Structure formats: C-alpha cells, structure tokens
C-alpha cells in the first residue's frame, strides 16, 4: 500500500526522459484512473511537461521533476531505516519473567 | 507530544547510573502517575533494576537499558531526518500557475 509520494516516485522513475501512458501504467503498477490523476498533478506542480505526438500523450520529466524523484527516493530510503530502527527498539521491549 | 519510546528515552538518559523519582519526574518532564507506569514497564523489560534504599525507590540502568537508550536515540534522530526529507519533497509540490 503506497502513498502519494511513492506513487509519484514510481511514475517519475519511469519517465526519463519521456513516458507515455503504457510506460506509466505498467512501470508504476497503477491503473489508468490513478495514472490520470497523478500525471495531472505532476504536470501541475511542474515535474512533467505534456505533449501530444501521434495522437498520444507524452510526458517529459523536467529538471524540477528530477529533483522531486531524487527527494522522494531519499524519503523512502530514510523511512526504511526508521522501520528498522523501530524494530530494534521493539526487540529490547520483551520479557519472559512475567 | 511524545510517544512511549521517547518518554522511555527521556527516563533512561536521566538514570545513569542511578535515578530516584525526583530525577525521573524532573529529568524526563513527566508527572508521578506517568513516571510510575513507565518505570514499571522499564523494570519489566529489564532496562532498569529497582532497589529501595532509605525508604526511597532507586532505579539503576542495566546493560540492556543502555542499549535501549541508544536505540531509541537512533530512532529519534532518523525520525527527524524523515521529517526534513518529507518537507523537501513538499517544497517541490507547489505551483503558482493554476
């Protein structure tokens, strides 16, 4: 179960330099309805530019989009480290005396 | 607003080598009712030993307790890094075009 940040990451990392909807749906593992919503959001915040070529929508990652991809990646990796650190605390919160 | 892990950290870092209730209440910034609950938990999971000396309860951090303190500290620090990383993503999710 992915949140918004992570879906965006999964889109963006499949849109370098360009992506159509096939690449987005299959690369990010999201359906057409979800893809449409997020793509539109990413165009709005300037992470992707949109073109039509051969009657197909083509998205291109922007410099700002590359930075967004990098920052989400960094968030995800730290979040993983946080889960591990929490598990290490939890291991110490057991007892067999009681 | 602190969760359980963090309160425990705030107790433990004030119980080296020993702490009475004054040191726990004032050092961890928690009331007597909260302190009683957490102290009891920390004794149960083997992070503190409890003695009575001069009719006062004295708690001593154990080797396991020192490790618990260290691991919570590490959790807290990573959690802070996660907040910052999230803020950096958020900064990129704005637009003034719409």
Residue numbers in the entry:
A (entry chain A), B (entry chain A): 7 to 104
The authors write:
The structure of Sso10a1 reveals that it dimerises in solution via the formation of an anti-parallel coiled-coil structure. The domain at the end of the coiled-coil is believed to be involved in DNA-binding as it adopts a winged helix-turn-helix (wHTH) motif. Based on our findings we conclude that the Sso10a proteins function as chromatin proteins; they bind DNA with high affinity, and display different architectural properties (DNA bending, bridging and stiffening).
Dimerization occurs through an anti-parallel coiled-coil interaction of the α4-helix. The four extra amino acids at position 56–59 in Sso10a2 lead to an extended loop within the wing domain. Note that the Sso10a2 crystal structure suggests possible electrostatic interactions (K57-E59 and E59-K57) between the wings of adjacent dimers. Such interactions could underlie the observed DNA stiffening and the salt sensitivity of this process (see Discussion & Conclusions). The increase of RMS at high concentrations of Sso10a2 suggests that, besides bending and/or bridging, Sso10a2 has a second binding mode which leads to the formation of stiff protein-DNA filaments. The effect of NaCl concentration on the stiffening mode suggests that this binding mode is determined by electrostatic interactions between neighboring proteins.
